[PDB]
């Protein structure tokens, strides 16, 4: 399955039904014939495959990799520092762009769940989205083609010297 | 430039000196390419007398390859020995000399200020 904290779906709530007329539903018919004819021979498949499945159980693993100096502990010239730093840099600019993309897919699947309350009901999606996205730019944006940690590191220093004077006037 | 040196002999293939070198595998990729240069002039040769490349002369194209090969591998010792003597050189000088080669101690990045250039 999937993790319900980092993909978060409310909770299903469906009418009765409670129907009036005395003609017969065929949507209920045909779902009838459906769950026979279909769902149950696919699910004697799916069940054979999950035992043959069992009995071959191999396992993989999620690659842990420990930090390194970042490159503001780097020497300048010092190639092999900064190559550890610019690599680690590199794996988790990567790792952003999929935080992004979670962010915009709860976006989307609450729009597309809320409907025609999505302009009240995804109020706290769309403020994530709004506030991971400041984040984002301020790490990211304007790095160009030739993005790195060094870049990175200036685009930081610029920020903080410019918000720096601004507090200093006040 | 090194031809001033102290200790130079005149005229000299392999000074004495270049016996402490490591001499140049006989199979090193560049006498590897040296015994192909001399098969490939053994055959071109074979072109150019209008005889069969591959087949004529086979005593002529084994002496192509055998001359390439001995005369590369004297030839890269004494370019190994200069190669030596250059950097024997240079890092004495720079021994006598500590006052026109400072070890410069450099700054971390934390300290150093890059300006940032936006591209948009
Ligand atoms: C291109 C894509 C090609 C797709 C091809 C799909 C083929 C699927 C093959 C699975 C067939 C499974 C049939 C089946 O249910 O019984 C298998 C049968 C198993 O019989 P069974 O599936 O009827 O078992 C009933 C359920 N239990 C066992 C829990 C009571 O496999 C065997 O031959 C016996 C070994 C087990
Ligand atoms: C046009 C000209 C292009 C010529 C291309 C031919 C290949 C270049 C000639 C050198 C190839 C052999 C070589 O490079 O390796 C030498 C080998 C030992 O090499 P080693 O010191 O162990 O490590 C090298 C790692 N890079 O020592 C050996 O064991 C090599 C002995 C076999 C002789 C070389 C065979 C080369 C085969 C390619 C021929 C293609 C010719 C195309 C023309
Ligand atoms: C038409 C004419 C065609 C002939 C011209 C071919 C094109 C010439 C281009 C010039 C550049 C050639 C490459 C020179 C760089 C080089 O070959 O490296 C040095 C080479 C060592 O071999 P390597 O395996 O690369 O390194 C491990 C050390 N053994 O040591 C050598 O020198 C091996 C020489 C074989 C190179 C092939």
Redesign the interface.
């Known amino acids: 399955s999937w993790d319900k904290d980092v993909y978060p779906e409310p909770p299903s709530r469906t009418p009765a039904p409670s129907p009036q007329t005395s003609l017969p539903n065929p949507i209920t018919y045909l779902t009838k014939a459906y769950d026979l004819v279909v769902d149950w021979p696919v699910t004697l498949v799916r069940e054979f495959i999950e035992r043959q499945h069992a009995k071959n159980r191999t396992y993989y693993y999620h690659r842990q990799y420990r930090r390194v100096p970042d490159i503001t502990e780097c020497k300048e010239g010092d190639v092999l520092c900064i190559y550890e730093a610019e690599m680690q840099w590199r794996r988790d600019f990567k790792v952003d762009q999929e935080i992004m993309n979670i962010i915009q897919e709860r976006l989307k699947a609450c729009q597309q769940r809320e409907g025609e309350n999505y302009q009240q009901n995804c109020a706290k999606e769309l403020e994530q989205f709004t506030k991971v996205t400041k984040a984002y730019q301020d790490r990211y944006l304007d790095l160009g083609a030739y993005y790195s940690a060094r870049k990175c590191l200036a685009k930081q220093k610029q920020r903080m010297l410019e918000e720096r004077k601004a507090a200093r006037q006040e | 430039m090194m031809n001033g040196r102290p200790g130079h002999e005149p005229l000299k293939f392999l000074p004495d000196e270049a016996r402490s070198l490591p001499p140049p595998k006989l199979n090193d990729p560049r006498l590897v390419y040296m015994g192909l240069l001399g098969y490939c002039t053994g055959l071109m040769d074979n072109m150019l007398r209008m005889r069969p490349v591959m087949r004529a002369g086979l005593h002529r194209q084994l002496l192509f390859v055998t001359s390439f090969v001995f005369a590369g591998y004297f030839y890269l010792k004494r370019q190994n020995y200069l190669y030596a003597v250059k950097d024997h050189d240079m890092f004495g000088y720079i021994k006598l000399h500590p006052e026109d080669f400072p070890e410069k101690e450099?700054?971390?990045?934390?300290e150093?200020?890059?300006?940032?250039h936006?591209?948009?």
């Open positions: 450099k700054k971390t990045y934390a150093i200020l890059e300006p940032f936006p591209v948009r």
